[PDB]
Amino acid sequence: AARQLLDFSQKLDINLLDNVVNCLYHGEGAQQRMAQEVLTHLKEHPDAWTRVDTISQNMNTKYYGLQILENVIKTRWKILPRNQCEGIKKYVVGLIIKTSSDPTCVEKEKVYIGKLNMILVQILKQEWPKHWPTFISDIVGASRTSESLCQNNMVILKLLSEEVFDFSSGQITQVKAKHLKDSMCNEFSQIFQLCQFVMENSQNAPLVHATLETLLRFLNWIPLGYIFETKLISTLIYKFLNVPMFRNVSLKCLTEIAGVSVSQYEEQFETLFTLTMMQLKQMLPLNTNIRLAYSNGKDDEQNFIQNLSLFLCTFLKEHGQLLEKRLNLREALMEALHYMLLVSEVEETEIFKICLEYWNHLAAELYRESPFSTSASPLLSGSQHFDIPPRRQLYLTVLSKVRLLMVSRMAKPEEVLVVENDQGEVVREFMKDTDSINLYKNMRETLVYLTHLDYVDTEIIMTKKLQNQVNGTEWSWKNLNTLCWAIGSISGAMHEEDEKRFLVTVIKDLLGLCEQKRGKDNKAIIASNIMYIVGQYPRFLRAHWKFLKTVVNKLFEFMHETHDGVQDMACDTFIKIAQKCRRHFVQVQVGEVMPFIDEILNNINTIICDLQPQQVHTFYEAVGYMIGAQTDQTVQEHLIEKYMLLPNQVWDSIIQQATKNVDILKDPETVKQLGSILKTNVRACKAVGHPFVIQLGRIYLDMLNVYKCLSENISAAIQANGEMVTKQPLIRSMRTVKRETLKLISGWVSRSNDPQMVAENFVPPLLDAVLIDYQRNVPAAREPEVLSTMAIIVNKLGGHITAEIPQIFDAVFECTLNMINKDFEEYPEHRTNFFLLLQAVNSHCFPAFLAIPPAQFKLVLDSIIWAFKHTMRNVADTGLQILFTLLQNVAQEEAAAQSFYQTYFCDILQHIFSVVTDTSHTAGLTMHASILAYMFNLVEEGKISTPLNPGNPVNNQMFIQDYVANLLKSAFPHLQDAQVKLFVTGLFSLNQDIPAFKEHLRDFLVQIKEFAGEDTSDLFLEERETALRQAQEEKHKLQMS
Amino acid sequence: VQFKLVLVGDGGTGKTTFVKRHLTGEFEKKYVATLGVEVHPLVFHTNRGPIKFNVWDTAGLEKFGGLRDGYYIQAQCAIIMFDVTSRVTYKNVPNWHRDLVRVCENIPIVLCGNKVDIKDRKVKAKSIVFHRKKNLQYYDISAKSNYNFEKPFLWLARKLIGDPNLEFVAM
Amino acid sequence: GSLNELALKLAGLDISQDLNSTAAPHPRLSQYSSLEQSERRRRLLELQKSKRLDYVNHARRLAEDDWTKKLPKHYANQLMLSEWLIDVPSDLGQEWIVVVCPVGKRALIVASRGSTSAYTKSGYCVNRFSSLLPGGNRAKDYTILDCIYNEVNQTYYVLDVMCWRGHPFYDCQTDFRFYWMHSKLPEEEGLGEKTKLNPFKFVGLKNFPCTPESLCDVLSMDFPFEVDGLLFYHKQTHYSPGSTPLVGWLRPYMVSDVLGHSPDHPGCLMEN
């Protein structure tokens, strides 16, 4: 019979206490356990007493209980019988009192405690001021007698603190937070007075520490005199930091304090730094090796180290012009500045990230002093030259060391991700913004600054590194890769002429290095570095073409290299060099008669026969960029034809054979081929851009008829076998042609100098071929990329295509709506895409919407409400901007606007309010507020026509105030008419400051989740009544000018 | 040889997709929000035998919360997660951490930027700084491409076993 | 211009040390690791053809993916590659043969275990499929062939054969290897035809003599493909992976130098 829901009876405990142990211990049954306990949150908690009192896995079971109790308090509290409010009050206070000081509560985990304490914080968040006045006052004394009730009380104070200062944004209404602040502020002294007491006199370890920690969270808000007009900082440095355990809380505190703005407290900061350091030098010496002490140090010292990373970095970063204005601190900051360097050798690409935050800050600051080199020459008298700028003169020696750092620990410049597309495709996938690349760039920046401040020093350094690789026998792959990456970073940070000398030197000795080494594991990695380095300096390959050629030809050579990835190396390199040095490839260079491209094309097959699929593609992009240069339309055309001559032959063949038999376009190989032939065609078009039409035209119609073929060959299959056909070789393949086809069409329309023509030539064939077909496909076969390709091919044409949004929007609009209009799940693509498409026709084609059946247009709005009701943040957000947009696009047509309001206006306000008071869509916040806001603004004037219909004495302003209030009251019966009046009037007050309006929205979201009830009037009814006035008395100090 | 890893983050974060990738090498493109929790065992094989993370795949949405903290009880490690494409979801991180350590005084934990693959990222690695002072590991992951895909697990593993040079293996 | 010491200096930059590689253009068009001496080396190459290698073991390994000059331990560099033909052999009349090779991709076809698979000179799988080659439809009876795959003809033109129904032909002189082709390829059921278990036709590449008259007539032929260039096998060469001066390649011309308002009209033409 093991399935019991919980109704009334003399309801037992030995049972529930079994379901708990289930959910937390065993297996799949746990599903029904967990699924049942979620449900005992219905009627209420008359059991709370029942369980908590009568407690093996009790403490869990009690836990749960407390959960219920807490729901009760967070909400019902207000309309509770006042006496029962008291009953909880003393129930909890007492429960804690006992649960603390226990001859064993380490066992009765810090859990039950902390959630209990946590509850008490919850209660306090309700009455603490008005109905618990002796509270703080009392518990002070309550600790000074007993340590047990104290240690823990430090924790009550902690959570209270977070809850009222940290996490009060959202979890509390706007004004009640103000009232709890200047309330904790109020009687904070009697309790700081407490923590000190402890620190100065108590010897009980755990107590002391939980006070450090509770102090740590006080430091976010407590008034500054408590920090600086107090011997606090002194207590921490002299008394707590030097001490193994508190070692850390001590620092983190320090750190926090070191983070304020010195204005009035410079003296305190000076002594805090020097003192801290007396401590630190005493502790972690400066002759100590931080690298090991970390690698070998356990978690005891791991964090200490990372928090030094933070105290250091944040302080140096926020008190610098403080750490030089006295010849006396100069030596201390050096000590500290030296710590930073030690810490920076730490193998931990997260500590090192903090370290590099400073490093880069310094670099920037000393780049803003002087971005120039200390004019190199001594003076004719011999004297010092005086051109070293005031500050770096102070870090010279140490910037030498940070340069060493960047060029040593230089980070991986690129992030290649081998990983196979959703087509069974295996590819290389170049990432754009990853914490990785961020490491790279920040190091690059620091070495670019530190290069402008003395590039003679970078050169010098990077040569001692490279030397130490050739002979120097610091040789290792990793380190060579790091040397050349840092070489590739500092490109263009060097006077050209300077860097000519430089490169020639650098790589010359790397060709020398590459001969030296025996092998081919080494010969290759070397080589690769030579090729990054070299391709990193196109300024160079442009002033030195004999060399460009030489590097390109070498490139080609490596393009038959059968050693690992040497080939990928070569192609990347070539495409870099092609984009950058792209011009020299199509013009005649001193030294030969006919343009290099020619030879290249006249040799395509022999260069690229040992490449595999992708490699050849990248090659075609490669020569794309070259053909994109030649601007001479005649030659560019001849060139584009001979450039697309190889693939075109494949294509032309497959296309003869498909006349004779439209079956070969079902042939697994010939589709493998229409695929690769297209991927080529797409890269090509990418590098080549608009003139590529010459090619595209050539196949566009036929391409279309094959896209259309494959499409009907897939739906078919699918219609007769299930979406399951999709997970097999040939369907995947065909799909691929369709996709790469649409990626070809969007690809090319995306970058065209002409709209008119494209709209008049390449658009109408889409209609039947690609659009209507999408309609005719079976749902689970319709290609989503059609929608998004349409979307792209509307932003590029705009007005020109606005006359056809009828025809398109027919093929696709409804048929696709019906796929997205059951739930908010199936078809995620279609959802997102379809909506980018609607977004865009709306944007660049609103006239359309204007010229269609009111029933249709209606149908379009509806779908938009449908967007922003979505739980996927993109569909709903995209839906929102389509809304805010569309409101404004309405604004222009004075004609259509008015009626638009007379039908949809209120009928939009219902939907938006709906979402706003929905707990799910909270990334809307700024959009909801934005829109709602703009609409009420709008009301106060723009809506020139009567909605109520009782003439003008029911003018619109007041109407709306009214229907909004009614709408919300009825959806939320608990709210007293007061909470509502307040809010709604705040919709026309906070009207123009949407940061403020957003504030408001949340204010209300809190009000509904909690039963404010009759009696309670702690919602400062009036306080804010005038508060919104200050908002209204600015909208006309600004918007009347 | 096993452990309990609570998996927290807000709605649509990609918590569910993440673990499921991990459990089948499937990728789910559909958003269906977990209601309450749903613990999935997982296994990796390593330098030192096998290991199993008991992934308490918790919910994100307030609507469907469940027994939240109630699931964190007896947690031995964790993973707050967020979506680098919606700034909002990093702003709630602090709250998740909160509830978490209010149950687990010291348990190895990991923070995960997800969606690193959408080339319109709105949480600049510049902006991610939280873990630092709360002393959690951080990782850039995508469940759509397996960028730094198993970092989160390999790390925790190294921590719970007390072995820095513990590398995963094929078998 | 001192950088000209790099232009020359980037010149000397080599991954290989294969003499007269066909990666780079013919050792005439530039002016390091390349001499005028094809003929010398050919000699000691032959004069050292007393098997030391377990080629039999190898065919297995290849054909089964099990891995315990030198034998190339995986799928890259299993093909015997041509060095540019430079030293035009004293004895070309009756001691060399020539394959007019077509345009496409070289490939090691390795058909075993019920499958067939083409690789590039660099152990990269470029197709997997079903053939009528012994081991590649459907017994420890594999096949290994050296082929150019012509995309426009979906044909794998075979060049040479190193293994067949489980017996290494590496130990064998080319005039044989090739006979074995032409004697055994056109005798497989349908290998040279397109079907549902042989999607790709396999066609043996003809060879001819290098006698003055020959090269003559051979240069005016019609072929079933597009001419890439010409291969030269010393009649008596065994099969050794990687560059060997015993196979000289040359492009078709070099020879007689070497001792001589809308889009457009829709193909397909179906609905609008």
Ligand SMILES: Nc1nc2c(ncn2[C@@H]2O[C@H](COP(=O)(O)OP(=O)(O)OP(=O)(O)O)[C@@H](O)[C@H]2O)c(=O)[nH]1
């Ligand atoms: N681009 C991209 N999309 C992702 C990635 N991970 C997940 N998604 C998408 O994100 C959504 C996944 O939802 P969930 O994994 O359930 O996220 P969740 O709401 O926190 O998980 P549950 O509530 O437990 O079900 C789907 O839309 C996936 O298509 C990713 O790494 N990259």
Ligand SMILES: [Mg+2]
């Ligand atoms: Mg969720």
